[PDB]
Subunit: 476 residues, 4 copies
């Protein structure tokens, strides 16, 4: 079973006024599975009016009641994990097992943020005149416009949504048209748990028309976007033209520094498993594997065997560990990346081709002998491709790791305290994981530097983009 | 005695490569008093190269050394405050007494920030696996491009500068061409204190050309602007287009709520004093006086008396209490404001005219019976004009206070806990002062919401726009 | 139904090795209702060995798993609220309605602390040498010995227990022999939710023998006591002799300052309702009512009518709003207080006598015209007695409020911001509530100054007594 | 040149009312060099009355003024450091170079704490009812009684003093009778800087009589002791009996773990240097050297060489690197320690004897082959003796490090992240230094666990024992 998806406006699942829809396809087969409403300006207007009202209601609900309502929604998400996972796999491609992991980690996210909303603390400042009380109070910024991508349909919504609700803002999101049902189910849990009419809204349609209307509108006080660097720059540019608060999680290009002293088997297992997660369609996916020359050959061979062990297929079939890529553009993007690697003299150690003629299946691929000018070492591939290059000195791996304008995630494998410390200071990334894969828990900051954007989506720092800070000084 | 001004590039005071200069005029006379170097692109390229290596040097100086160096700069600023104040008064117009208070408080600000840099703390998070250490590390974002205006030539540079230096960033500021000598004496204190070559740079010239070149440049990792709403929109847009971190301190339109239970004498002395500070040329200048009908007329007469007691004249005369406006565009703007007020049926209770035919002298002015559609009640006057309206109910005054897209400062006068609490929760401002004038100590956040911008320039919060936050997890 | 109570040692409900028990009485009738095991030194030894083991296990369980186990126990407490309330009312005396409130607020407490255990943050300090990492880590102190009283049998356990478990300490408590079943049910929820063997223990017996053995024993690293000031001083003295960490919540003697501008009806309702809560057997119960002379007579008369409206009786019978006092000593203590008031010239405005000849029923009592040397104005009465005295100047009410060595809770009623501010600065109390009764939520600090003891039992400060702080500096 | 010492009471240097004095002797010669006033009860009563009104004055001085005054004191301490150091060396014995470093670092400590007092922040908590403001306010606890020992006559006073003054407390210290002039010059700097009359007081006499009188006295709200474990037990017991807040910094017995992968030359230079600092008369002096068997013998020989290179002599000679021990009871104690070591079969590798027959000179000593039952491996030697033992496995060394009831400082030498992480989580100490000697900067917490005491004397945590925390909730 796969369901058609509607807009959520003012507590009501509704069609667009025009009645227009967009078709949704299963990327494992290319076959239509359902449809989603395509919003016009008139539905956005109704959504903006409701977000204004929702904001006025939700800001007045004490943090401990907001928190309990969020926790109920999380319990519902958790109760419905199987059904939501099933929707997600059909629209997006990832294996059922990975979809369930994402839905459960959404529940965990909502819960931590629920509790953090109760710890949005002001402060009292020792005063220069004891007749006066000097305070700093924190309040919600106002209605949020959010724009989220298809690669983790639920999780890319839930951090933003959980942050907005915990601070007491209202929230209007344009979820992905290619993966609409799983996020709509996430929103439905919040409605079912008691979040009032107007506090949350959900639209789909033409992304550029929606973001062009929403971002400049006087109801919206904060914009949040997760996506590509080039669309991020257009949106941050418009947000600045209209003096809106904005945060952005954009491309990454994660380096992986496997040092001379690394546990090599651990590196292959950790960084290899993390590469093929969601078929590499992850903003923090390990991409540029910088491997000390003493162990490069051993690493490369073991990474190749890891890729060869993956079972490619429809994400509903058990045994599947690597599903369809999410859409046909991702297939074309992979061929372009592979063609360019071969042209510039790199070696395809395994994979490198489409599998079959139906759906978006690409083989897990490992590329070695990669020169610095290959597309795979410069543009974010966002697909099931690891690129390996050797180095002799740790300092040259670190310079390579910082060479690109991306800087989101970084990985390393090493045993010495001095190398940890050096990597910690020197690597230009938002997030660094050593001797393990990415474990991006809600309590941990999650955000970029440079072209990867700005603003955190974890920790207490995740509430700051949704808050205004007010200095209040009262003389008795 | 007034001094020509040069660029500060790589530890040296230098002319522009071209030899071009711009004339500086005394706004009390219209007469040339000196000139400032006019940078072109070649000078900016040298400033940027120096800023890069400066960032690389300064980020390695431990915090406690950076603090001690900053405190040395502060002590020199304190000692030279009267000679710096004489420069400021000549180029900008404010009375000497105000200029001294500005410069002495610059020293106070440097000291607080020097100490704050020793408290940029990371976090250790209780881990999900006890075999890993999860930390949150803070580090300087990089070279900063700062753009500052003429109203507080020193003070608008000093918080930005101190924040940059306390975090380990390097700093390149374009200070105002019409008030260049006093900001250059501020940077000189720092050079004399031992801030190394390239860590600070100062340039002057064509604002648009410089900002268009600096903001997109790869060296600049962060932008900070203080000035008008419409210019900040243009710059935050450019900054968005090149994915640069940006803070913005923009227009205000500060309401004053004088409640039924207010002490009227206090309200006039506090808010009337604050209105005519630097001739209203202040982003936090009280502008819209909303006075409870029971005391509207009594307040209006007392504010009229306050304004008629100011002594208008050259700021170098020590008894001068209202100097010349900073520049001729400010006279033009006061004429338009008063003209519209008269045309919409408001009453000019005092002032309303230029004084003399030389310099930029405008009389301190009070406007009563002001309709909500008057320019003075919608656009930021930025000059020595107060606008008075009545109200019956506190909640009508709060709604008027929140009508405008501006939201920087607010003031109120009241004695009940209930009113204090209400004004605290409901007024859409970044800073609220109750029963006293503005006291923006460095330890207190200072920043806007809505069209007034974003980012704070006081408190620990002042450092965050200059920091990047990095999640580090290391499995042992 | 009322059940006999056993010791909890190493995951097992067990009898004492001697087989000794103590009888439990219903204070509403004087009739035996059950019994509780009476521990000897040999059972304590087995308890201390298990706490050592429990500490070694529980310290290794990640904060997010500890947190989920605590939340389950809270859900169980909440599921069993009726059954636990019933036990409590029979052993302790309070009305069923109030017992249910306490059990539910216990669940709320456990939950907030569960979440706070995940936010025991270390920090990273900017280093004096960048080659070195300077960190501050937080770890559990070790096994706790706790000693809790009969007045809120569950709540006096739950803050201490929740704090210890959230930090990762083990916990051994000696609960009250006169009210053992309700706390034992609280502990049983934690066993049922999965807290491992040894992490929690529960003993009863002779309090002085237990605290004399536990406090000096090398397994115990932290002592916590809630009780009387004189027993607190003996226990803190012994804890210091053995260099143990100790916190103490001791007597209060709460002032209530009803100022000239008070809402009088609000004062009677808030402070009057709070006085007769748990029949005044509360460490923060409003006791010394300092009332401005203009409204003293009106206040006194309305407080008298509030007391006269209470329905005294068995706590299981519906309609009951004031139950039996908890034990016969409390009845004797009340007569002594009333006899002394009459002897020193005060007036008994209502109540003042035992009701009936069975059980521990005392009438709700209001005393006026109280001189400063009455026992009720010096010793903590801990019973259903309010004592009223007038004042003319707010400064003399404040001096009276600070006259005694107690300082736990304080109350006031006033409308002006200046009075709030003055009271906030000047009143020597741990907790001050204005214009409302006590709402001691888990997120709020709860602790004394002076003879009322030290250490907080709310907020993040509640974890600090259960934590050690370790500076770690590692040179690369 | 050495100066007799007086009491500091109410802004005046005075004799005891009685005229009694105590002789002060130079420990390098046994010869009188001056005398110190010997307070009786009447002097203490005047000190306490002054401390009370001092507390009332100082708590009203805004933080920023208190800071500026403290910084002035710091500057005077810096300027006078060499004259203060000459006093210290004569009365206490340490080399002049060490005495200068102690006094210069006292100035650094005052400065950090002065700034920290401006950051004693309260909290605003998100309320359960939006009509109330819930705040957490911090305020000084009250007059402090401080008791300090002879080992760092200045430095043991300065953190306590600075913490007291930064929070708004008044401070009355009993400094050591055997080293009285240098602490009195520290208090003089503060008097000269403008700390008002009564805010500080200094007394000398009979330690027991003074502590027995001060600790129970109603004026004293807080006690702080640094000294021996057995004396601190006696004082923390007395403090408990009168319900006074207490902090305690007591004995240490610092392990040094030299791991298999350690740099031996670094370990000897860092830990060997630290052992013979102030002749081992330091609560954090490395004592139990636990060295991996592969390098035990090499470490032992190198430490022997380090010790034989010290230059023993009068501390006034600038080339002296090990001075006389502070007092004759310290010789007696070194003789007992060495004697027991010999009797239990340990080997004296170097030193082991008194040098000369005048003064308190004891040779730098290294003991190897030390059994676990030797006095030197159980009791704090507090003198110039290192005790060496081997180990095979890191976890046996950790268990030995944790065997003793002491837990102040620890040291280790190792290069692997795994070992660093393990030592961090498992070593029962308050401070751990890895690959370097002790660097206890004021910004870092400094305090023990178990028998070494409680309370921190660095970091923000240093202020908490001098603060009370007050929950304030005000319903509007
Ligand atoms: N950071 C991330 O997690 C993330 C997510 C999705 C895609 N991407 C990057 O971009 C590529 C995405 O490919 P794509 O084919 O989806 O192309 P795209 O660049 O057109 O899409 C980027 C995202 O922005 C949205 N979008 C596009 N134009 C928009 C507008 N004008 N207003 C609002 N939203 C708009 C899309 O719905 C999509 O989710 C990937 O290869 C990857 O490198 C990154
Ligand atoms: N504290 C403040 O926030 C502040 C300060 C000065 C002016 N203003 C506002 O601006 C109004 C008009 O000011 P004005 O007469 O200086 O005119 P303006 O708006 O042309 O200039 C405003 C400021 O921005 C700068 N600026 C202008 N264009 C720029 C560009 N392209 N790049 C970089 N910097 C640029 C100027 O150097 C000046 O300091 C004032 O009346 C007031 O409302 C606000
Ligand atoms: N930094 C420290 O923590 C520190 C400092 C000095 C001594 N000690 C320990 O104490 C041992 C012996 O020291 P000692 O020879 O000075 O003998 P001691 O134990 O008699 O004195 C220790 C300190 O406590 C003080 N003191 C003693 N009785 C007191 C009382 N009743 N009230 C108040 N203060 C009192 C002394 O003035 C002295 O400063 C040392 O060898 C060492 O183990 C520790």
């Amino acid at each position: 079973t796969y369901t058609d998806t509607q807009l959520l406006i003012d507590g009501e699942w509704v069609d667009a006024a025009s009645g227009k829809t967009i078709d949704v396809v299963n990327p494992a087969t290319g076959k239509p599975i359902g449809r989603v409403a395509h919003a016009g300006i008139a539905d956005l207007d109704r959504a903006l009016a409701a977000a204004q009202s929702g904001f006025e209601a939700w800001r007045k609900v004490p943090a401990h009641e907001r928190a309990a309502t969020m926790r109920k929604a999380a319990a519902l998400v958790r109760e419905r994990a199987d059904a939501i996972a099933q929707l997600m796999t059909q629209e997006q491609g990832k294996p059922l097992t990975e979809a369930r992991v994402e839905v459960l980690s959404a529940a965990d996210i909502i819960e931590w943020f629920a509790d953090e909303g109760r710890r949005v603390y002001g402060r009292i400042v020792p005063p220069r005149n004891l007749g006066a009380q000097q305070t700093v109070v924190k309040e919600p910024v106002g209605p949020v416009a959010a724009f989220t991508p298809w690669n983790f349909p639920v999780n890319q919504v839930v951090r933003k949504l959980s942050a907005a609700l915990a601070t007491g803002c209202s929230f209007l999101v344009k979820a992905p048209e290619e993966t609409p049902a799983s996020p709509a189910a996430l929103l439905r849990a919040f409605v079912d748990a008691g979040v009032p009419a107007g506090v949350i809204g959900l639209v789909y349609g033409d992304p550029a028309e929606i973001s062009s209307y929403l971002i400049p509108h006087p109801v919206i006080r904060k914009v949040t976007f997760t996506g590509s660097t080039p669309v991020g720059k257009q949106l941050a540019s418009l947000a600045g033209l209209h003096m809106k608060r904005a945060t952005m999680e954009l491309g990454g290009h994660a380096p992986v520094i496997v040092a001379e002293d690394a546990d090599v088997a651990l590196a292959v297992k950790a960084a290899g498993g993390a590469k093929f997660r969601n078929a590499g369609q992850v903003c923090i996916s390990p991409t540029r594997f910088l491997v000390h020359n003493s162990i490069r050959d051993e690493f490369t061979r073991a990474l190749v065997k890891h890729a060869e062990g993956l079972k490619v297929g429809n994400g509903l079939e058990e045994g599947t560990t690597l599903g369809a890529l999410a859409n046909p553009r991702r297939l074309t993007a992979m061929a372009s990346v592979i063609d360019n690697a071969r042209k510039v003299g790199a070696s395809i150690e395994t994979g490198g081709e489409r599998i079959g003629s139906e759906g978006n299946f690409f083989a897990p691929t490992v590329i070695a002998n990669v020169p610095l000018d290959a597309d795979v070492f410069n543009n974010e591939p966002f697909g099931p491709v690891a690129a390996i290059r050797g180095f002799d000195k740790l300092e040259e791996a670190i310079a390579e790791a910082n060479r690109l304008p991306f800087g989101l995630a970084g990985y390393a494998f090493t045993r010495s305290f001095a190398n940890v410390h050096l990597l910690t200071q020197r690597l230009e990334v938002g997030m660094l994981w050593i001797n393990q894969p990415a474990t991006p828990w809600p309590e941990m900051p999650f955000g970029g530097v440079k072209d990867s954007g700005y603003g955190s989506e974890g920790g207490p720092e995740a509430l700051e983009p949704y808050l205004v800070t007010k200095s209040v000084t009262v003389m008795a």
